[PDB]
DNA sequence: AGCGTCCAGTCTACC
DNA sequence: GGTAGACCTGGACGC
């Protein structure tokens, strides 16, 4: 991917954008803190920063950032180095994916912070999206740090060190319910250095899975979500109840467990399974039933 | 109406 | 070895 990057005032401008749509990316099920503004831009809090991203054709405008932050954080965050055009061409050899892709041509897989992804998907278990977003914003407001953009105060996602001094019931005030003890355990294990998130990428995918699943409340799905959305292992296929029913309806024509859905997809899609999953998901939400 | 009821991954207890 | 049932919260749903 070749871009023309320029720093103009309080913003960074990227020209040569392809295979990118903000709505499709931000509503693909991968993330929770990006919110649409009246002009169609999206304001989000990630990596202790607040930025506004706007896309005008092939021109991305990131407000409230500099060249240093763009190259250090946002380039990788929006996975800009990857050719999704090639990915879609390869996947479109499957008629099912080709159809799904036409509705989500601009989906990119964000490379998000490991800790935030971990807690976010802990929150996500047995939960609906609107509620997950409210709980995550509650965690940030209650426990995070204030940062300001255009006169409005935004809150960073709380680090393990910013959570450990609170009891479960204090954490539970975020409306996370029975998941409070899971957040508590995750914070404790990371804070003590028992689970090292920085060195996690040095391990195999199976090893990462096992490390993460030591946390009370982290099972196969949460672990796989961290692995895909934060570590960037694309030969994975996180199986939720939706993708199970989607694959059942469109491929298998019979019922199956989340596990058998999973190995079928990884076999068929290989190193592009994670991308295939995103396309199928936004397509499933587009169709409804 | 204004109530009942169903329910959107992981753990636990128990096979 | 494997899994039925419970589970905070809270909108949708039937009558
Ligand atoms: Na666990």
Automatic annotation (TrEMBL):
Keywords: DNA damage, DNA repair, Glycosidase, Hydrolase, Lyase, Multifunctional enzyme
Protein family according to the UniProt entry: Belongs to the type-1 OGG1 family.
InterPro entries, sorted: DNA_glycosylase, HhH-GPD_domain, HhH_base_excis_C, OGG_N, Oxidative_DNA_repair_enzyme
Residue intervals of the HhH-GPD domain: 123-285
Pfam families: HhH-GPD, OGG_N
GO biological process: base-excision repair; nucleotide-excision repair
EC number: 4.2.99.18
Lineage top rank: taxon: Bacteria
Name of the molecule in the record: DNA-(apurinic or apyrimidinic site) lyase
PANTHER family according to UniProt: 8-OXOGUANINE DNA GLYCOSYLASE (PTHR10242), N-GLYCOSYLASE_DNA LYASE (PTHR10242:SF2)
Reaction(s) catalysed by this chain's protein: 2'-deoxyribonucleotide-(2'-deoxyribose 5'-phosphate)-2'-deoxyribonucleotide-DNA = a 3'-end 2'-deoxyribonucleotide-(2,3-dehydro-2,3-deoxyribose 5'-phosphate)-DNA + a 5'-end 5'-phospho-2'-deoxyribonucleoside-DNA + H(+)
GO molecular function: class I DNA-(apurinic or apyrimidinic site) endonuclease activity; damaged DNA binding; oxidized purine nucleobase lesion DNA N-glycosylase activity
């Amino acid at each position: 991917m070749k871009y023309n990057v320029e720093e103009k005032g309080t913003k960074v401008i990227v020209r040569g954008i392809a295979d990118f749509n903000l709505k499709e990316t931000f509503e693909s099920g991968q993330c929770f803190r990006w919110n649409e503004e009246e002009d169609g831009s999206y304001t989000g809090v990630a990596y202790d920063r607040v930025v506004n991203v706007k896309l005008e054709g092939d021109t991305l405008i990131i407000d409230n950032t500099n060249l240093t932050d763009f190259y250090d954080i946002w380039f990788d965050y929006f996975d800009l180095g990857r050719d999704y055009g090639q990915i879609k061409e390869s996947l479109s050899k499957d008629p099912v994916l080709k159809e799904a892709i036409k509705f989500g041509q601009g989906i990119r897989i964000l490379r998000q912070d490991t800790w935030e992804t971990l807690v976010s998907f802990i929150v996500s278990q047995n939960n609906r999206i609107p509620q997950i977003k409210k709980v995550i914003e509650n965690l940030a407001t209650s426990f995070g740090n204030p940062i300001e953009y255009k006169g409005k105060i935004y809150y960073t996602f709380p680090k393990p060190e910013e959570l450990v001094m609170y009891d479960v019931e204090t954490i539970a005030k975020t409306r996370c319910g029975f998941r409070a003890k899971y957040i508590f355990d995750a914070a404790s294990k990371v804070f003590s250095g028992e689970i090292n998130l920085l060195k996690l990428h040095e391990y195999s995918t199976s090893e990462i899975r096992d490390i993460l699943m030591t946390i009370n409340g982290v099972g196969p799905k949460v672990a796989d979500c961290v692995i895909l959305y934060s570590i960037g292992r694309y030969d994975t296929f996180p199986t939720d109840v939706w993708i199970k029913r989607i694959v059942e309806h469109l491929y298998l024509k019979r019922e199956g467990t989340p596990v058998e859905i999973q190995l079928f997809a990884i076999d068929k899609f290989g190193d592009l399974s994670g991308f295939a999953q995103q396309y199928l998901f936004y397509y499933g939400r587009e169709m409804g039933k």
